[PDB]
Amino acid sequence: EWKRFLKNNWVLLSTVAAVVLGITTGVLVREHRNLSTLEKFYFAFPGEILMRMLKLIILPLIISSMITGVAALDSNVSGKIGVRAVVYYFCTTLIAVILGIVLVVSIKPGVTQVSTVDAMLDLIRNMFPENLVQACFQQYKTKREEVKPKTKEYKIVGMYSDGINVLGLIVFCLVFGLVIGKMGEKGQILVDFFNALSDATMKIVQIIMCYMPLGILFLIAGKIIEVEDWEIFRKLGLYMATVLTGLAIHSIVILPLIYFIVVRKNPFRFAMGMAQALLTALMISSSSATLPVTFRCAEENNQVDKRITRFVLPVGATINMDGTALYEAVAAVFIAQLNDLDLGIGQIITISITATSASIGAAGVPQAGLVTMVIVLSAVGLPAEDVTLIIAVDWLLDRFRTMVNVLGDAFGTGIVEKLSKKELEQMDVS
Amino acid sequence: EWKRFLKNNWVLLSTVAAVVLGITTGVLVREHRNLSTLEKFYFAFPGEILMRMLKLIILPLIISSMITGVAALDSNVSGKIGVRAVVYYFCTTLIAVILGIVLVVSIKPGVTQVSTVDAMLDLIRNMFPENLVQACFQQYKTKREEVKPKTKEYKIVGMYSDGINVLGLIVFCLVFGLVIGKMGEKGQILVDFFNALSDATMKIVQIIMCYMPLGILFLIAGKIIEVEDWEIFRKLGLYMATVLTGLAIHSIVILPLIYFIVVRKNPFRFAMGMAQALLTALMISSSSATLPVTFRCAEENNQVDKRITRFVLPVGATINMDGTALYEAVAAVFIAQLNDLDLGIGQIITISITATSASIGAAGVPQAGLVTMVIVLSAVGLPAEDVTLIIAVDWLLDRFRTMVNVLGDAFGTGIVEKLSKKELEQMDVS
Amino acid sequence: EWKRFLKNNWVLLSTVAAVVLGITTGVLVREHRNLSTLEKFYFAFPGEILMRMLKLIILPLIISSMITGVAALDSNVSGKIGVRAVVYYFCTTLIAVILGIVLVVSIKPGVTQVSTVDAMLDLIRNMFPENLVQACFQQYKTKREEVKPKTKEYKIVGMYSDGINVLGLIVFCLVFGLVIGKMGEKGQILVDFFNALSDATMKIVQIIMCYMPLGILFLIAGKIIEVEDWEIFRKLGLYMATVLTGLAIHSIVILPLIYFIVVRKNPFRFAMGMAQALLTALMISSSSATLPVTFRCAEENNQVDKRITRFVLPVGATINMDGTALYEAVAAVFIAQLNDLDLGIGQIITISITATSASIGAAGVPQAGLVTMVIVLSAVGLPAEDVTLIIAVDWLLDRFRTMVNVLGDAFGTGIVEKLSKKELEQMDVS
Ligand SMILES: CC(C)CCC[C@@H](C)[C@H]1CC[C@H]2[C@@H]3CC=C4C[C@@H](OC(=O)CCC(=O)O)CC[C@]4(C)[C@H]3CC[C@]12C
Ligand SMILES: CC(C)CCC[C@@H](C)[C@H]1CC[C@H]2[C@@H]3CC=C4C[C@@H](OC(=O)CCC(=O)O)CC[C@]4(C)[C@H]3CC[C@]12C
Ligand SMILES: CC(C)CCC[C@@H](C)[C@H]1CC[C@H]2[C@@H]3CC=C4C[C@@H](OC(=O)CCC(=O)O)CC[C@]4(C)[C@H]3CC[C@]12C
Ligand SMILES: O=C1NO[C@H]2[C@@H]1CN[C@@H]2C(=O)O
Ligand SMILES: O=C1NO[C@H]2[C@@H]1CN[C@@H]2C(=O)O
């Protein structure tokens, strides 16, 4: 069974082979020939074509994915189980993002061993853009300029700079999907159009991901050619330790705390009841393929009713992703600290809004998370070409992210069950 | 019946409350604290967000509205009643626009107490843009530059400046809707797509209009803070007098003159026959909700046949709007004169084309006329932030505009009846 | 039968009348009044409006045409006859384009009697653009800039210049149409949407072509006003001789050579068997209206089976166009040589890719070839206003282009028949 194993596990095997070949190619080139500044640019050309192909696809991706995601989410929510589950999902995703931001600006991996009033208003000025086609490639920014005729008086001058406006497209696609999801039959052709557009965009993303290992091979070789000291391995170790301690103090402290405030039972017996689901999510790395095991572990081991589980588990396997959100926040601030920049209070809120509302805008596909890392890094303006320092270590943390996601919706069943008990009686008598 | 009256009349009541609160807030701020140049900009920030939200929505609005409007108008016109009614509607709308422009440049409310050959060719150069995506945000303009090697010889240099091209989008959406309205079954998916897009855009415009009174509150407070002399109240009085004398000499002189040229009967007995329809259009301010009363007043009081009324009245309640067109022309030139600019012969024809062809491109909705005032002011390049000086007095003239619209299509039934009498005999014998 | 002949042949008659009237108008103006530099620009204004209308329509044209063309081509190919016929079509179109480029840079009609490494990488950088809305109006270009701190070291700086990116739109529409053609039922609304969009775009192109003769009248008058010497008639004669010798050595030498390598029979008896089809394609100038005659001449005169002819002939009448591809390559390099420019090795490959993949992207319509000449001239950045020097002589070469196309797919039936004989036996026994 040699060819079947290659056909089953092509993604992880080809990523690992690309990283190994890129490291040994950069080592064998660095110890055989020097390279000038110009021929260090022609050597990292397939990585440049990959970074162009990844930024090509995010503009149909966020539009189609946000519209169909919030339309299907408006369709799935029916009564009072739906609103409670959705409020729970977005509160825990926001708590995970805030925990990740706090941990990465406190530990600071990557650093070497103005007026905030204007930035927090350019945020709201970028949520409502003045043009919907210019929001696809250019952003707004205001500066304070002094005026000339005893006191010092200024005024505010705004201008449009280059780079895509992700907040404006996210907010307009949210409002547009909520509008066409509520029109009923008169707006079904729009929902079908954007559903087919989302499926076509995910197929093109799969084609780009089939190209990807050649690009990351030449990118990793071009990274380790110019590296002279063994310093960035320490920064990658600290980044992996930051993501792992974020998932550790999110699955152990915060989510049992929420279960103890709401349900007021013992959360650790509940976590011990779901052992086989977490073991399966460690073994196979999908939250949707772990689903029958967590149905079995929440239904017959824990005393959770089936009528609530049937809604909370299959919907929470696709829009409740806490570990991926913590990962994307920590990785975006790590790439920002690696390039010797400083994030303000506008770029941190743009990271925290883009990473929260990307559970909707990833279409529930495992082979798209890299593209989400290009969205967040293009939501604030960072160079995306350091993304190749995260794909090298992604296969070490993917399983732990899956475990944190599955533990999130597994706790969510019990929390939503204890939160609303009147509706089960109302549906049990009639 | 206190809450039902609030649920019925929320628009007018909330606009009036916003104007009153903005005036008393600006008075109580102006007599308690001075404001610098910078903190006069942070105080008028919700108005800036409202003026961004209003300019966000006009680009899907004019595309969807013009395409579905001219497609449904091509569908409604069947024989020779249709062409006569449509030619009548657009001739009277053009006459009302020309009368409004003449009255506002003769009275001149707002003023304080080049080469036209190139501009009239940049008009035609902007009706056919060189790119269809750049027409969504940028315009063309030619200047005359002297050439250097006995006579003085020049040449022409063109460049693209910023701001949306409304004429190019209007002309291309006219041609595109006429094309897909005539393709039959092969172009029905496009008609359904743009119909659903138009309905979604009108729902988002209703959301923006639900936000609107907070924005106009802070805009009116920011207007009357910086005002030192009681001069702009005189200009608002002259603007209201200009709109009222435009509607007065359009409903009394011009439309009975057209009825006397075409029909050669007495128009004033015809106007006295439609008294209850005009009284209802004064009472309730909708031209589509006044429709059964004008059916009754034209059918049984006047001797107008039913077979022509069934087509002229419900189609002319949505695309024949003379009072709104006169209003938008007068208000656009009033905002142009209030900012101490001068309109050429290119901007006046752009105002007269954008205001005429906005009866099609407003989708027949009462809660969208403000957005049309943002289109005309963005068709020529005027600052839209003086729109808040027109919403303060709009509820005084809305009922008179409704009366002029209803009188227009009420005269139109009799004019189209006397114009074509062969078709009624041809459909009466067979 | 005077009015029926005018209704049948309006295109050729109106083009010839426009050329004759433009020449006699330029002669009668040049010998009656001098014209300054400024009034030579107002005289060529309808041609400027025509050249704006032609560039307005190519952006929906290439998108809709490439998507529906490659989707319907993916649908038509079923077994092994389809792949063989498609590979044959694109190999012969590429051979015709290469022959046309070689002949026009060897003969050089139009001439008067950097680093290629960077250009051949900006080609691949423009095939994958960084933004999909900016690909509709702007292109990428890299230059080499020296760096300043013993050897001379440079770096590479890229920037976005104006003009549409045709390679990026062509490649993305190819991949998008291949994706939605393979999704089956889930992507049928996209195929129907782009089919209706393609039909509407071809109707608008027919409207523009109905305007066209007034524009080419004023363009030809403006051309021959400024001409002082009788030199450009010699260049037009050499251009017609270049296109005619390209079609001559493509129909006589190259295609019988391919038939002799593959089939190893006598190709000249095969060409003599199809005499009536070529005579009809000389008489009427359509490759789709010549189709029953070439069915009859290949079926009953030549010994070609019907089961292969039923697929090769009606599909090869619309996507196998060798003469039009040779024509567009020769005409693009002729317009480039007429304006005293020099084409690199990037612009020649952009011409050779845009002209090859425009058989798909012309929607199989005879009244669209002029628009394809605006695409190729806008794929490399040439001034399109010299297109009026090619429409004057197009009706002399259109019939010979039709003959070369028909000879191409007529040889293609026999080549694909001798190439695969196992499938006919497999479908004859079962
Ligand atoms: C580590 C600590 C700081 C975490 C604290 C988390 C809480 C702030 C969150 C987590 C889950 C939240 C709950 C999730 C779901 C709901 C249901 C929600 O229901 C509705 O909005 C009304 C539904 C209806 O009646 O229609 C009300 C808030 C509530 C109880 C939330 C209250 C706030 C909670 C407890
Ligand atoms: C104050 C004064 C200057 C106003 C003058 C207005 C006139 C110039 C307009 C108003 C209504 C117009 C009429 C409205 C409708 C028609 C039908 C229209 O019919 C057709 O186009 C043909 C229909 C067919 O036979 O198919 C011919 C012009 C006509 C009589 C118009 C002629 C010009 C009129 C009288
Ligand atoms: C003047 C000279 C230089 C012209 C040379 C032309 C050749 C390079 C081309 C012309 C037609 C081509 C053939 C057209 C079609 C096919 C079928 C094609 O079939 C497949 O790809 C496999 C189909 C399958 O098995 O599914 C293989 C190549 C082949 C023989 C091509 C081989 C190359 C050929 C002979
Ligand atoms: O549980 C998951 N399924 O798909 C996502 C998430 C973690 N692993 C995937 C990823 O983000 O790569
Ligand atoms: O009669 C009318 N119904 O709707 C329109 C028009 C006048 N009042 C509305 C407006 O334009 O605000």
Ligand SMILES: O=C1NO[C@H]2[C@@H]1CN[C@@H]2C(=O)O
């Ligand atoms: O055979 C042909 N039918 O349509 C095309 C091609 C040659 N003549 C047309 C053209 O390109 O103009």
